[PDB]
Amino acid sequence: MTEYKLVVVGAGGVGKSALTIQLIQNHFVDEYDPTIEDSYRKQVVIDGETCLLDILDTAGYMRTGEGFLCVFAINNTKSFEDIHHYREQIKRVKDSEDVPMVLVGNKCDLPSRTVDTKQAQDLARSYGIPFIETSAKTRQRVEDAFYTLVREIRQYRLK
Ligand SMILES: Nc1nc2c(ncn2[C@@H]2O[C@H](COP(=O)(O)OP(=O)(O)NP(=O)(O)O)[C@@H](O)[C@H]2O)c(=O)[nH]1
Ligand SMILES: [Mg+2]
Ligand SMILES: [Mg+2]
């Protein structure tokens, strides 16, 4: 079983825990319980590779993580602004510009959007990483988000 150490980062309340619990448990957490630091391990098959995912759900690990899910909420402009701070801190710690990352715009089921998809696409394009729009509430593209991050790490290891 190939291991992938994934770390979910982003401002408070953007749905990091909700996305992680949807992946692990197939259950939407409606209550907002602020996270300290939670670890999960899940065995999955991704593109035919049997994988062990080690997911660290952080509070709103930069050394141990191999790939980072950088989450903002599409109805929280400040959380989108704060992404740069998360990425720059990761880059500093890993002393690298190619660390595997996926940009996640969560809560896409909410109509009170203030981060336009074009803004998010331009940021992702700049960093050289994928962009996935999710909803933990409806479980839209939750697996896609985490599996895309796995694939980024896989491609990184193979150059
Ligand atoms: N409508 C909607 N609400 C969501 C979605 N994802 C999370 N939420 C809601 O937003 C709140 C915060 O979700 P939660 O996962 O704790 O946030 P978090 O980033 O883990 N926060 P923290 O940093 O404090 O640990 C919860 O009420 C949750 O139900 C989503 O896709 N859609
Ligand atoms: Mg949390
Ligand atoms: Mg605007």
Residue numbers in the entry: 1 to 60, 71 to 169
Reproduce, without paraphrasing, sentences from the article in which this PDB structure was first reported.
KRAS, the most frequently mutated oncogene in human cancer, produces two isoforms, KRAS4a and KRAS4b, through alternative splicing. These isoforms differ in exon 4, which encodes the final 15 residues of the G-domain and hypervariable regions (HVRs), vital for trafficking and membrane localization. RAS proteins act as binary switches, transitioning between the active [guanosine triphosphate (GTP)–bound] and inactive [guanosine diphosphate (GDP)–bound] forms. We present the structures of both the active and inactive forms of KRAS4a, as well as of the complex between KRAS4a and the primary effector protein RAF1 and compare them to previously reported KRAS4b structures.
To gain structural insights into the active and inactive states of KRAS4a, we solved the crystal structure of both inactive (GDP-bound) and active (GMPPNP-bound) KRAS4a at 1.8 and 1.6 Å, respectively. The largest structural dissimilarities were found in switch I (residues 30 to 38), which is visible in both structures, and switch II (residues 60 to 76), which was disordered from residues 61 to 70 in the active, GMPPNP-bound form. Unlike GDP-bound KRAS4a, the switch I region in GMPPNP-bound KRAS4a is in a conformation compatible with its binding to downstream effectors. In the GMPPNP-bound form, the KRAS4a and KRAS4b structures have higher similarity, having an RMSD of only 0.37 Å due to similar conformations of switch I for effector binding. For both GMPPNP-bound isoforms, there was no interpretable electron density for switch II from residues 61 to 70, suggesting higher flexibility of this region in the active conformation. The overall structural similarity is high, especially outside of the switch regions; the two structures have a backbone root mean square deviation (RMSD) of 0.74 Å over all residues present in both structures. Because the observed RDCs represent time-averaged measurements over a timescale of approximately 100 ms, the distinct and more complex dynamics present in the inactive, GDP-bound states of the two KRAS isoforms led us to refine by RDCs only the GMPPNP-bound active state of KRAS4a. The 20 lowest-energy structures refined with RDCs have an RMSD of 1.1 Å, while the RMSD between the average of these structures and the starting x-ray structural model is 2.0 Å. Overall, the RDC-refined structures are less compact than the crystal structures, with differences in the position of α1, which is connected to the highly mobile switch I, the β2-β3 hairpin loop, switch II (highly mobile), α4, and the segment from β6-α5. Some of the structural displacements relative to the crystal structure likely result from the lack of crystal packing forces on those structural elements when in solution, but others could be due to the intrinsic dynamics in solution that are damped in the crystalline state.
